Chains A and B, each alone.
Chain A
Amino acid sequence: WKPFETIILLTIFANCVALAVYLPMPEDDNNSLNLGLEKLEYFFLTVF
């Protein structure tokens, strides 16, 4: 009943932004940002 849904909406928007900034690479290549986003993916999973 407290505005808890607003935090979930904001974290959904954050997850969408993290999905947007991902840069696909050919033949199993990566950069620093992609590795950073992979670790950040667990933070959203735990919250959800």
Chain B
Amino acid sequence: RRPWYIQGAASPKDMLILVDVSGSVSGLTLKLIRTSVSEMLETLSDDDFVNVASFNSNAQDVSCFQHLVQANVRNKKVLKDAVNNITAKGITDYKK
């Protein structure tokens, strides 16, 4: 998980985290999903671009970004704060 190892282990990424927020993920799995999303966000550097989206019968962004961002400290903080606010409600739709 060290920055030098991550830099030397692969190439820069254009990552899009897709989060399921349908009703079935309510409970323990939603909290685990939030923690996992934060942990994976912690694996990105300034050369990677990331955005987080959620879908429950309809897909939308979780923050005020609306596209990929540089994934620096401030953007990652915003994404983490937005992610640790989601609620499980609705019906899953993977196509959308």
Contact = CB atoms under 8 A, between A and B. Distances in A.
Interface residues of B, number: 10
Interface of B: 22-24, 26-27, 88-92
A26 B25 CA distance: 8
A29 B27 contact: no
24 contacts: A25-B23, A25-B24, A26-B23, A26-B24, A26-B26, A26-B27, A26-B88, A27-B22, A27-B23, A27-B24, A27-B26, A27-B88, A27-B89, A27-B90, A28-B23, A28-B89, A28-B90, A28-B91, A29-B22, A29-B24, A29-B90, A29-B91, A29-B92, A30-B91
B31 to A, nearest CB: 14
- Secondary structure call for the A interface: loop
Interface residues of A, number: 6
Contacts of B26: 26-27
Contacts of A25: 23-24
A27 B24 CA distance: 7
B55 to A, nearest CB: 13
Contacts of B23: 25-29
Nearest to A27: B23
A26 B92 CA distance: 12
A30 B90 CA distance: 9
B74 to A, nearest CB: 33
